[PDB]
Design a protein around this ligand. Structure first.
Ligand SMILES: [Mg+2]
Length: 274
């Protein structure tokens, strides 16, 4: 009895992909594809995202009809909506799904902490599960969980993060998220056993909460990589995540879709279901 899944933002880039992966997944069944683009309207969702025989689903553009349709007891699992929609509409699409009882799986792009607070409230009151997901890559999130665990027994830790050299911001978003997570415990790391001298400014990286250091490397040849290094006497423990090309959200997306069924309220971060 596979899961019935709506994909909002269906004709979009990540959207097209997710449609593809749901087709390949037997325990997941696409009931409906939605997009704003008038140019993509009639087409079949499967065919459109590039595969062989077209499914039986056209790329319509009205949400509630499809929601109501889904929340009509299928006899199988509760229904899921995966959103990949422009920032404008994300809050309202999500809220609209929650209202109908349909579980949202959606990234944080387009959503402010205050809005998430509000969606949290709608979900608790609705007792409808919802996943807000800052990072979709499994490896990153296992790394994050593993680091959080380890931080309770190690007092010393540094983060090294390496990206392609076209990348403007430093440190990256993810290295900082990872630092917040570690620092949420209210434990201070890296307490000095010596007064340091910076012979050259910048050598020790940036300071990011509860004494944690982040170092940022930029070179061509890299894509996205992150390494967390925990130290103790006689001992080093290193968690690394490397990205090979930028289409590895998928297992996370599908994992979100499966795991949200277990939820009666909103959860921030995938590292919490895992
Ligand atoms: Mg980033």
């Amino acid at each position: 009895a596979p899961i019935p899944v709506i994909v909002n933002g269906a004709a979009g880039k990540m959207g097209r992909e997710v449609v593809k992966a749901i087709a390949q997944a037997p325990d997941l069944n696409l009931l409906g594809a939605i997009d704003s683009s008038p140019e993509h309207q009639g087409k079949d969702a499967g065919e459109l995202a590039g595969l062989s025989e077209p499914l039986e689903v056209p790329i319509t553009n009205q949400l509630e009809p499809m929601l109501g349709y889904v929340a009509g007891e299928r006899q199988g699992p509760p229904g899921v909506i995966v959103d990949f929609t422009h920032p404008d509409s994300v809050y309202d699409n999500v809220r609209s799904a929650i209202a109908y009882g349909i579980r949202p799986v959606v990234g944080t792009t387009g959503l402010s902490p205050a809005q998430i607070q509000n969606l949290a409230d709608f979900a608790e009151k609705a007792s409808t599960g919802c996943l807000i997901i800052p990072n979709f890559s499994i490896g990153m999130v296992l790394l994050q969980q593993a680091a959080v665990t380890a931080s309770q027994y190690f007092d010393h830790v540094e983060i090294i993060e390496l990206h392609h050299n076209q990348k403007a911001d430093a440190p990256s978003g993810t290295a900082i998220q990872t630092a917040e997570l570690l620092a949420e415990l209210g434990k201070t790391f890296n307490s000095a056993i010596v007064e340091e001298t910076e012979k050259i400014p910048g050598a020790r990286g940036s300071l990011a909460g509860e004494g944690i250091r982040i170092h940022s490397v930029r070179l061509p040849g890299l894509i996205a990589h992150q390494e967390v290094i925990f130290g103790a006497p006689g001992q080093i423990y290193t968690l690394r995540h490397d990205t090979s090309d930028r289409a590895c959200y998928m297992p996370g997306v599908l994992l979100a879709i499966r795991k949200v069924l277990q939820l009666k309220s909103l959860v921030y971060g995938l590292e919490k279901i895992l």
